[PDB]
Design a protein around this ligand. Structure first.
Ligand SMILES: CC(C)(COP(=O)(O)OP(=O)(O)OC[C@H]1O[C@@H](n2cnc3c(N)ncnc32)[C@H](O)[C@@H]1OP(=O)(O)O)[C@@H](O)C(=O)NCCC(=O)NCCS
Ligand SMILES: CC(C)(COP(=O)(O)OP(=O)(O)OC[C@H]1O[C@@H](n2cnc3c(N)ncnc32)[C@H](O)[C@@H]1OP(=O)(O)O)[C@@H](O)C(=O)NCCC(=O)NCCS
Lengths: 157, 273, 273, 184, 89
């Protein structure tokens, strides 16, 4: 299940958490890398209803929807394969337990810092049982220049 | 200079998908104003444009004009026209008198337009009989919105309900929710003659029919425009003509300040607080 | 019971010469609602009945519908549409959003509908040549209301003042005040090209001309309604469609609460009070 | 004449149990205006008289005045003050400016008063542990009205909730809701 | 007031006039206003503000009281109206 090409030039992600600065940094990276399509499909923040956040692609503006429940985010958007999880250290474990059992997700990225060791042990166990690739705790993420950037890897533009 | 030079990039709020004003022509929803006047769409047509952003058919634009002609003034007794007359007699101006009349269009006066659509379409998609919908609504102790009227009855009917019915029977294809509402009306007038299907219920169910049985609204648009409140706007924009008429009339009769005599009050104060 | 059997004689306030709601038919000005719909008078016809209490001719009713179509939404930048958008983004409701936008239509926003009619009709009834009028409104400060634009100048018309001007010159019999206003605009276009006759001035002078040149107004009701504010009523009832459109649209794009960032404020507080 | 010689009858609407304006003195709730000014109650005292129809104690009166002092202006960035500035700049007048700024005080602006009263009273009279209440609200997926403030923290206080907290701790007898609110 | 109370005995200095002249007297007799601000604030409308802010307590009192008495919708009966419509428009 642990594939080789994690991120490519045709990847699209689902962000978990109201992280408009990080998503706009990712969209600026994907504009700078001469990439045709943005690498974010939708965002998840469960504390308000669905809407469309407005983000900046190059010189122009586009819209990225924000959902409340993860089930609608997986149903409406099946082309994604990577879920970035900006949840806190106390709400990332349940978020990953909910998010691993979905179909289209091929890799998750737990950017939180301060997870319990028993919780990340159960998380690693379910991750190797399912076959997803986990880039988890206490990270800033990864960056594949020319293709993809996870969160705020590297810093500003 | 940096924006016109094009090297700054600022995030604009206020998305507003209606009425692009800049440029060589005042574009409405998507249609320029010369095309609006050339296609002869009336104030119902520009209501369809500005509110729904869908160019409506001609039997629906005329129905919107019929709604704004029927939901005009209904006398000065009712509470909104009463507040407009009180403020115009205290000599203010048009926007404050019309506005202090418009801040009574709530739930008991004139804001049944949306609840008599939400209720009648929530009891039609979970399909019950009218005789059980009335039983449920009395059992819960809540008022069937858009079924009651203070002064009109079946022995004293309001004619503006009949003018809309004789239009929505002919030019409207496939209007079942109106038939459902008429069934509930006669079920309730069999018991009490006071409870007559209002214009504030007939316009609600006829607008749900006009949205979901004519074109250009699928099922999420035509329920979003009920949940958002696009049917209260029909009453507010229709009754603005009556409230401005009452301001102009009380300004032309040169009436004085209103005082509301103490023989109509009965102060019921505590003893010694 | 004593008034029903008739021996009390209490004096009644609220004189209201409009819209007899009682009885069996909803009677408008003097004409029932069935005659209103049978004689095919639109919302301009019921505006002539409710506001002016006259049976307006069929060109004038269509002209009032034309005015309420051009004085609809004119972009969300303006003060009233901005207030409606801020109240809709604070999640309020339709009547408080539209109402708190409608409390800007005073003098600086929406006041050119009435100021440019009182000006052009005070300086036409005083017998003043257009060059003397332009020079009289020069020595006293006082920029001429209803004249001016920002882009659309000449050989580049307003294209919604042209529709109204075409309708008035084709349909109105004996229109002297529009011709006086066009002489004033021909004099003042020589100064700057973008001093074209505004739409807020053209609706004012065409409305005053319609009142004092069509039938059933003498000349002393025909400027009583100008003094009272029928033109302010025309602008408020026209722009209510645009403000309700802005409420529904900001409710439909699901916008959040507005904050107006401190980069655009510049507090100029005193030192220590 | 027919009611002055007392023979007719009239049902009178508008019951109004506040401020009898007739008679030889402007009576408030039950207390005349000379007693209002002799008993030296501030505007909190007449807020208690007109709104609540009780003569509130003199610590609750100063607390009502303290609430009307801290819920005064909080900058013109916020939406109601912004609408008041737009209507004043369109040159209207005081009552249309203040009124079209007042018609934003709904649920997202200024509704946190009634919302945080009713939420913390529905989570206390149906008694839950505070740790279970915050988990219940997180599980349902809505925020708690009361708590917030992006600038201040436990490091540096707000200094306008601090003065209110000082007043209720130094004047209020038997305050369980505040204690419960602090717990959360 | 002394001059005009001799014509009719009821013409006394009203509360709505004593608050006005005592407020103007405060602004132009106490410190911190010069004399060009203390007649600017009267022209701007800072005396309407005293009435509106004072009367807001009474109007909120009437709202809370009419909500607490469970009073229903008002209709204002036709025997208090006297419609004076035209004959047939
Ligand atoms: C507007 C309204 C107050 C007029 O009703 P009304 O003539 O005053 O009737 P009353 O409130 O005086 O009488 C109450 C009785 O009639 C019942 N009733 C009155 N209106 C009712 C209604 N729409 N639906 C169900 N029951 C109603 C009450 O349940 C009560 O029943 P009871 O005999 O067992 O006690 C009321 O019908 C209503 O709120 N309708 C919904 C809002 C609306 O449509 N407004 C438009 C017309 S103003
Ligand atoms: C001097 C200069 C700036 C003035 O330009 P302008 O277009 O006339 O600008 P203004 O604001 O003065 O025009 C206002 C005129 O329109 C009138 N006007 C404006 N608004 C009006 C309104 N609503 N109603 C009626 N009249 C109005 C004004 O009263 C005034 O007319 P007036 O001359 O009778 O007083 C212009 O001539 C210029 O650009 N000079 C520089 C050229 C040069 O030498 N360049 C260097 C060589 S390379």
């Amino acid at each position: 299940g642990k594939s080789t090409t994690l991120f490519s030039r045709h990847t699209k992600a689902i962000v978990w958490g109201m992280q408009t600065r990080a998503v706009q940094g990712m969209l600026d990276f994907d504009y700078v890398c001469s990439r045709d399509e943005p690498s974010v499909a939708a965002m998840v923040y469960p504390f308000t209803g669905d809407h469309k956040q407005k983000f900046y692609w190059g010189h122009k503006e586009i819209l990225i929807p924000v959902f409340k429940n993860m089930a609608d985010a997986m149903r409406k958007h099946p082309e994604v394969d990577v879920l970035i999880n900006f949840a806190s250290l106390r709400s990332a474990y349940d978020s990953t337990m909910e998010t691993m059992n979905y179909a289209q997700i091929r890799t998750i990225a737990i950017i939180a810092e301060g997870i319990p060791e028993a919780l990340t042990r159960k998380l690693i166990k379910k991750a190797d049982q399912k076959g997803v690739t986990i880039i988890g705790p206490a990270t800033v993420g990864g960056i594949k220049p020319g293709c993809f950037k996870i969160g705020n890897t590297g810093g500003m533009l | 200079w940096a924006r016109e030079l094009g090297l700054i990039r600022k995030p604009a709020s206020f998305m507003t998908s209606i009425c692009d004003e800049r440029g060589q022509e005042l574009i409405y929803a998507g249609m320029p104003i010369t095309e609006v006047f050339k296609e002869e769409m009336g104030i119902g047509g520009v209501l369809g444009l500005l509110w729904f952003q869908k160019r409506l058919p001609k039997y629906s634009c005329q129905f919107i004009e019929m709604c704004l002609m029927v939901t005009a003034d209904h006398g000065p007794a009712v509470s909104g026209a009463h507040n407009t007359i009180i403020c115009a007699r205290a000599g203010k101006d048009l926007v404050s008198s019309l506005t202090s009349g418009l801040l009574t269009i709530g739930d008991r006066f004139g804001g049944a337009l949306d609840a008599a659509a939400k209720m009648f379409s929530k009891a039609f998609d979970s399909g019950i009989i009218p005789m059980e919908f009335v039983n449920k609504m009395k059992k819960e102790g809540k008022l069937i919105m858009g079924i009651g009227h203070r002064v009109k009855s079946i022995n004293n009917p309001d004619m503006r309900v009949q003018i809309l019915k004789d239009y929505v029977r002919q030019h409207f294809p496939a209007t079942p929710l109106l038939d459902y509402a008429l069934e509930v009306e006669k079920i309730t007038t069999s018991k009490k003659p006071n409870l007559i299907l209002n214009v504030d219920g007939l316009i609600g169910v006829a607008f749900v029919d006009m949205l979901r049985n004519c074109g250009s609204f699928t099922r999420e648009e035509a329920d979003e425009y009920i949940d958002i409140g696009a049917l209260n706007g029909i009453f507010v924009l229709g009754r603005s003509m009556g409230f401005i008429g009452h301001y102009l009339d009380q300004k032309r009769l040169k009436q004085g300040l209103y005082r509301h005599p103490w023989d109509d009050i009965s102060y019921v104060l505590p003893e010694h607080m």
